[PDB]
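Dear all,

This email documents one entry for the complex benchmark we are building for the journal club exercise. For each entry we list the sequence lines for every component of the assembly. Then comes the predicted three-dimensional structure of the complex as a token string, followed by one or two observations. Please use this as the template for your own entries, and keep the labels exactly as they appear.
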Amino acid sequence: TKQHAFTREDLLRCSRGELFGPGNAQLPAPNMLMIDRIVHISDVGGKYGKGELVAELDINPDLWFFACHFEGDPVMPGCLGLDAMWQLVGFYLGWQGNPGRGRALGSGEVKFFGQVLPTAKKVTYNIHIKRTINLVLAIADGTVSVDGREIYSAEGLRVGLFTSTDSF
Amino acid sequence: TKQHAFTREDLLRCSRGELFGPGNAQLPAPNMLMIDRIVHISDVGGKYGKGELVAELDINPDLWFFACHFEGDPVMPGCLGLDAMWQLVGFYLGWQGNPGRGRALGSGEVKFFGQVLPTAKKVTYNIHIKRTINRSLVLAIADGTVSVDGREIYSAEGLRVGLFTSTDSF
Ligand SMILES: CC(=O)NCCc1ccc(S(N)(=O)=O)cc1
């Protein structure tokens, strides 16, 4: 709960276990990492008064998922945009100083009503923390947007921290 | 609606547009493809009388996602297991002979209550078709489970996939 913005290099440090420390929350490394930068994170304000994350992924035509998904119909997988939102809620719990390794526990309603094409410039994630239950877990609502346009929503994103993940 | 099982080589042909034809449903190619084989597909019977899919992914410690998810703590991303279930509902709509390209529309409740480690042998997907809507838009609603080595680890209610003769809405 010191830094309120993180750079790509900060996020790669996190993926190595070197931001929050060994045994604590880690972002995935490439090619599962679906965030370039966290432009803002806070534990106050947001839609519910329990904090907010705003993060960005830069798009170019050469990103790996465009060639295989699908052949002659390139589109960013919806599952990876949803994953970015789980990734961010895990980051939030680690950023708050809780111990242990992140697992996605699932979500309420998810809706896809738009897409990320290879001609897009930038994906923005808006995450509104709804509740932290202190085993340690966060509930959040999120949206995925591409160059200003909302395309995906998730209600009741759930992520937990595990001080032993072997009971799972 | 002749063939009730598909090999990995059949799924790759699908990913090239060569199973259902150009402009119709497509599986992803590697490395977004999360299915090795469709063991069973049918459009009658099943939990709701609209058929079922059973499909498998072989697990080994070298699958790409274990190295980066996470360093020192390898676990199959839950989002890829969910994605396999959306890809299977898309496949079903194609296999029924509907035209157009597939897009996932989303899900009701998803629960992850176990995990796939790099020491596992096989992931199995069970998809129960609940409803197909054949109006202005071709749509399927389904329930799904992901299991690893016999144990149920994920559930999804109200998986929704559509076929688009033009995906220009999105
Ligand atoms: C096999 C088939 O028709 N697939 C199309 C359905 C389909 C499934 C998943 C996604 S995603 N990864 O963008 O969430 C898109 C389309």
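Observations: The longest strand of chain B covers residues 151-164. The pocket of M25 is lined by residues A 77-79; B 25-27, 83, 86-87, 90-91, 94, 102-104, 161 (CB under 6 Å).
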